[PDB]
Design a protein around this ligand. Structure first.
Ligand SMILES: CC(=O)N[C@H]1/C(=N/OC(=O)Nc2ccccc2)O[C@H](CO)[C@@H](O)[C@@H]1O
Length: 585
């Protein structure tokens, strides 16, 4: 339409060049047989879904859609593009032009054509398409998800849905590494049963269809042996287990050393160099080997600007072709400043991979991590060419944070976490988006009270309003308009939560029903907290006492519950109100 819809990720260069036009009921398609197979299917599926027919002939002044790669000799495309091209973009880059009853998609390579089609899909709203000239390409070459958490692994259905979801948002990496799949870690030696294999084949296939590298991770750390013939048999077990997966089409692999006791850096890396030599190089079509060392956060890797002993030997031993992940300054931390990547990258003498622990909640499962990528430097691409997030065991609600990770890593320099976060929920939740924002807003900051802290603060604007209320009140100023405003906010929280319980799809609701009820409880305690303030100002001892018992119950209910939400806002406000003695004349 006239207006450009929400797009994700944010295209590098987009310009509106006209008024927009309505695509016709059937269209002329050019380039099908010569253009990327996966791109065309995704194009077909979108056409089928939106009841847009294809002409088996051509003209009747129907909309023309031209699709192809720069390398193809396609004149209609050249003409339809009219000077703009993907010729000089990086891999996965594309050019899209919609003008005057024509849409032209040109990829730099097949991946770029597929991605062009995803942008086309996001651009079309009720047959209306804006008129734009786009050139697009990612900041970072590897973008995706590592299923690396503890707890119930994603179901097969979950994974397939996730893969399609990655393709649509232009993420190209899925690392299969769940800690509590025994065939990955606890029984890392034994092959998959001849039906978990069938499920593997589907994962592999779906990833191919969506331009996602399926990375198979193995974590031998617990009981692997290195010395003598034990070490040899155990090494062989890696190869046979990897080949078993290569044989069905796995062309990316990871060997992980995270959270084991064994700190033998030379042993770990020689296993990696052995595998890199006798497996990766020998096969010729396997991507760079990926790893994570026993020391994987800056606190664990570094001492006063220098590598620790393990890190030193690992860095100096591991092959330059091997991609090394780290998590940042801590395992779950506020930030990765440019200076942290510079440091670690300097130690390994290369571009690093990030294993980012958000939205993962395995260490603190009562809270859902529902905020955007936050704290990650917008120039990280200077030292990082591989960005993954470790998600929650809750596949569906992970989409929100994943959605924003896709924008951060594709278009890093323009990344706006607030805008990305709003876009994620808008694009995911539709009619329910405004209610979903109210609830998810209260559930962004992860904090286990000890080693793990990350994410945008919960409900900052509400927090600022609460702060404003206390200083108006402790200054003896009129806070009545603010009090009234805060009543509106607490009522609004409870009503959003109720609309969500009533209207969310079950697949999302089964993941958040407890945290929903908890924000309701909290909102009701916040309401009772204002009642306390008002009764005090009014010198009504009775109304105060009654409100205090309610507020105190709601807080106690919240504190005892499994579910955790809004600790520093909705919850703490009640503690603040209980402790504020407004009657001291
Ligand atoms: C590379 C990485 O972060 N590995 C694991 C990881 N490892 O950190 C720890 O092992 N932390 C820890 C160790 C002992 C006791 C308590 C926490 O942290 C993530 C967040 O929970 C897990 O999901 C990851 O699988």
């Amino acid at each position: 339409q006239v207006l450009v819809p929400n797009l994700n990720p944010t295209p590098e260069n987009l310009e509106v060049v006209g008024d927009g036009f309505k695509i016709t009921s059937s269209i002329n398609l050019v380039g099908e047989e010569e253009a990327d197979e996966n791109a065309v299917n995704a194009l077909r599926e979108f056409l089928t879904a939106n009841n847009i027919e294809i002409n088996s002939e051509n003209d009747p002044n129907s909309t023309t859609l031209i699709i192809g790669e720069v390398d193809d000799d396609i004149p209609e495309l050249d003409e339809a593009l009219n000077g703009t091209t993907a010729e000089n973009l990086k891999e996965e880059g594309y050019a899209l032009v919609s003008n005057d009853g024509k849409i032209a998609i040109e990829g730099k390579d097949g991946d770029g054509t597929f991605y062009g089609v995803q942008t086309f899909k996001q651009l079309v709203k009720e047959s209306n398409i804006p008129e734009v000239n786009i050139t697009d390409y990612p900041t970072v070459s590897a973008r995706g998800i590592v299923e690396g958490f503890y707890g119930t692994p994603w179901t097969h259905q979950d994974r397939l849905d996730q893969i399609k979801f990655y393709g649509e948002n232009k993420l190209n990496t899925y690392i299969y590494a769940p800690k509590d799949d025994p065939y990955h870690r606890e029984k890392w030696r034994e092959p998959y049963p001849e039906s978990e294999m069938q499920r593997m084949q589907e994962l592999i296939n779906a990833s191919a269809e969506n331009k996602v590298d399926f990375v198979f991770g193995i974590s031998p750390g617990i009981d692997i042996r290195f010395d003598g013939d034990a070490g040899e048999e155990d090494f062989n077990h890696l190869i046979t287990k990897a080949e078993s997966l290569y044989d069905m089409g796995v062309r990316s692999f990871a060997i992980y050393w995270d959270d084991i006791q064994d700190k033998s850096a030379a042993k770990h890396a020689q296993v990696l160099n052995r595998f890199n030599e006798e497996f990766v190089k020998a096969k010729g079509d396997v991507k760079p080997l990926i790893t994570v060392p026993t020391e994987y956060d800056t606190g664990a890797m570094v001492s006063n600007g220098q590598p620790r002993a393990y890190t030193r030997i690992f860095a100096e031993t591991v092959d330059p072709s091997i991609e090394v992940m780290w998590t940042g300054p801590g395992v779950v931390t506020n930030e990765i400043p440019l200076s942290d990547a510079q440091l670690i990258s300097g130690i390994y003498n290369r571009n690093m991979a990030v294993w980012w622990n958000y939205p993962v909640t395995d260490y603190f499962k009562g809270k859902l991590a529902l905020g955007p990528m936050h704290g990650l430097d917008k120039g990280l691409n200077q030292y990082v060419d591989f960005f993954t997030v470790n998600p929650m065991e809750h596949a569906e609600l992970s989409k929100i944070s994943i959605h924003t990770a896709a924008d951060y890593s594709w278009n890093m320099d323009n990344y706006d976490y607030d805008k990305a976060w709003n876009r994620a929920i808008d694009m995911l939740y539709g009619d329910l988006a405004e209610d979903m924002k109210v609830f998810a807003n209260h559930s962004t900051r992860m904090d286990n009270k000890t080693w793990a802290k990350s994410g945008r603060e919960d409900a900052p604007e509400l927090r600022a309003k609460m702060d404003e209320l206390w200083n108006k009140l402790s200054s003896k100023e009129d806070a009545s308009a603010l009090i009234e405003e805060l009543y509106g906010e607490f009522a609004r929280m409870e009503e959003a939560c109720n609309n969500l319980k009533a209207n969310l799809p079950e697949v999302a609701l089964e993941e958040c029903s407890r945290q929903l009820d908890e924000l309701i409880t909290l909102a009701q305690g916040d309401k009772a907290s204002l009642d306390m303030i008002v009764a005090q100002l009014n010198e009504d001892t009775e109304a105060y006492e009654s409100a205090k018992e309610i507020a105190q119950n709601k807080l106690n209910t919240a504190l005892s519950s499994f579910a955790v939400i809004s600790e520093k806002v909705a919850q703490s406000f009640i503690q603040e109100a209980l402790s504020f003695d407004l009657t001291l004349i």
